Amino acid sequence: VALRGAHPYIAALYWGHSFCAGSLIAPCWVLTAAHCLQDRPAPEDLTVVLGQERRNHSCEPCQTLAVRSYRLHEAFSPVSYQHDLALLRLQEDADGSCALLSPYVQPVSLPSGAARPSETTLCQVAGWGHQFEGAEEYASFLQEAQVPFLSLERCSAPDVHGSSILPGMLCAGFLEGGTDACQGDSGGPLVCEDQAAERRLTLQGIISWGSGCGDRNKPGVYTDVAYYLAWIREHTVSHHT
């Protein structure tokens, strides 16, 4: 598998000094977490960079886009984080174009929903994660971890995430194994085996919440993209029908 062109769908989202990642699901659409947008920033103050290697760093294949509008799931809860997803409609330029697809910028495929994930499913989470403030020249690189899907039964254990796990959420990671809580970003991609899909890997999770960087790792909790599949289709459709 490739490495600088490793996760060409991952988007870097900026507002003020806050940060979130998301996933390019088509040239004009990015999928992220609703919690990233719950304070309702003006679309004009958002910046999306596709193809970025280091946060805050410009780069030759980096593409910077404005956002035209965005939609949070109408039922998102800021308290429990149930239904933690949003769509960004990117601003098209003079030509009707949004992301210029390239070897560094490519959309990720949505799950089929045919494929019901199991503890044997293999996944990957990408993100930048924790980085010490100051000294930009030392900005971290995108990194990735291989994580297994973690059953609802094991995730809802009192000892793991308890009654905090709600329908529409899924878990991935190791019970004690470690190292994802310091490397994922709110809204970032969990990409897993679909097999019943044209592509080998599809986007099956959006980084939602989990244990704090620094504490002992728990599995991360992700928005279960497949559960919202009709919501994502309906709000991206090209034509009213």
Numbering used by the authors: 359 to 599
What does the article say, verbatim?
Subsequent cleavage of α-FXIIa results in loss of the heavy chain and generation of the isolated protease domain termed β-FXIIa, which contains only a nine amino acid peptide heavy chain remnant disulfide bonded to the protease domain. Here, we describe the first crystal structures of the FXII protease domain, which reveals a zymogen-like conformation.
FXIIc is a protein-engineered zymogen-like construct with two additional residues present at the N-terminus, resulting from the cloning strategy, that effectively block the native N-terminal residue Val354. We term this the zymogen-like construct, as it is similar to the result of protein engineering of the N-terminus of FXa to induce zymogenicity. FXIIc crystallized more readily than FXIIac under a range of conditions for both glycosylated and deglycosylated samples at 19 °C. Data were collected to 2.1-Å resolution for the deglycosylated FXIIc sample, and Fig.2D shows the electron density in the region of the active site residue Ser195. In a second crystal form of the deglycosylated light chain, the S1 pocket loops are ordered, and a short α-helix in the 180-loop of the structure results in an enlarged and distorted S1 pocket with a buried conformation of Asp189, which is critical for P1 Arg substrate recognition. The Arg73 side chain from the 70-loop is stabilized by a number of interactions with the 140-loop, resulting in encirclement of the Arg73 guanidinium group and the formation of hydrogen bonds via the side chain of Gln151. In HGFA, the 140-loop forms a hairpin-like structure folded up against the side of the C-terminal β-barrel, interacting with the 180-loop close to the entrance of the S1 pocket. Both FXIIac and protein-engineered zymogen-like construct FXIIc structures reveal the conformational hallmarks of a zymogen, owing to the lack of an oxyanion hole, a disordered (FXIIac) or helical (FXIIc) 180-loop, and an extended 140-loop.
